[PDB]
């Protein structure tokens, strides 16, 4: 095992439909600021943020981004205990603004990658 | 017979004595803390006894002796 660098944002993606999941994944794949901060896609799926998503986020010190999905109270409690951050969103550009915010936060400033 | 097992036990015992000598202070502090917590636990046990038995307070003129303290 090796300790992960600070400039590596691990993200779980959860969508209401496969179309939304694919759209978010395309946005992520457009990423080009690899040098300043890597954007790893630990796992993606369709449905409400689940215990397995929280477990992946805990295992990889990642952040779960939910697109028009729900985070039950039990899941919220477990994520709070395990130190994961679940960020639900209902607008694609709001989610993208949040994602760029996290990338800038991980940076050593504002990120240089742009979605369009 | 040979004394290989006795030699193994000898090395174990010598290393244990050396470790105790090397870490006596920490062991003393931990043991004192353990004794204090043991006394508190025993007092809690007696308190449970009488409170469940239905006494508002420890019996008349009763004070729990500190049985786990040297003094």
């Amino acid at each position: 095992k090796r300790e992960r660098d600070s400039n590596v944002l691990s993200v779980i993606i959860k969508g209401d439909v496969d179309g939304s999941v694919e759209a978010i994944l395309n946005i992520i794949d457009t990423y080009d600021a690899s040098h300043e901060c890597e954007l790893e896609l630990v796992h993606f799926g369709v449905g409400d943020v689940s215990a397995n998503d929280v477990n992946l986020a805990e295992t990889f010190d990642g952040v779960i981004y939910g697109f028009n999905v729900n985070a039950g109270n039990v899941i919220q409690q477990s994520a709070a205990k395990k130190g994961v951050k679940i960020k639900l969103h209902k607008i694609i550009y709001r989610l993208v603004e949040d994602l760029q915010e996290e990338l800038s936060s991980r940076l050593p400033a504002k990120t240089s990658w742009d979605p369009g | 017979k040979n004394v290989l097992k006795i030699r193994r036990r000898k090395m174990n015992h010598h290393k244990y004595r050396k470790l105790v000598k090397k870490t006596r202070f920490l062991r003393r502090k931990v043991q004192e803390g353990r004794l204090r917590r043991k006394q508190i636990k025993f007092e809690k046990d007696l308190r449970r006894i009488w409170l469940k038995a239905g006494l508002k307070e420890a019996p008349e003129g009763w004070q729990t002796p500190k049985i786990y303290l040297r003094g």
Binding site: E40, H43, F60 | -
Partner: protein
């Protein structure tokens, strides 16, 4: 031991079976955290392929990767069976080939 002693002790209080690496389950699901190699104990010499997985039970363990060559990268899901790798100390889980993200060996 006299008959009285046998009666007093009762039947032999056999030790309970102790769970192995897989918590006594045929397979577990893991997420490959890292991939690396390990030198086997003497006299064997090799760089055996291994990975670190967060098993579904919450424990992290080193799983051996059988077969000539593989592709397991980080973040990938694998199934892991028991059975110790004889020449690796402390490694007691084999990644099952042909399941989830670990494809069969290529001819």
């Amino acid at each position: 031991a006299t008959l009285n002693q046998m009666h007093r002790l009762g039947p032999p209080k056999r030790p309970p079976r102790k769970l192995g690496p897989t918590e006594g389950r045929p397979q577990l699901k893991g997420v490959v955290l890292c991939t690396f190699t390990r030198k086997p104990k003497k006299p064997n010499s090799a760089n055996r392929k291994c990975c670190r997985v967060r098993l579904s039970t919450g424990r992290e363990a080193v799983c051996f990767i059988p077969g000539e060559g593989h592709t397991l990268q980080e973040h990938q899901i694998v199934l892991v069976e028991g059975g110790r790798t004889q020449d690796l100390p402390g490694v007691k889980l084999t990644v099952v080939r042909g399941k989830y993200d670990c494809g069969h060996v290529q001819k």
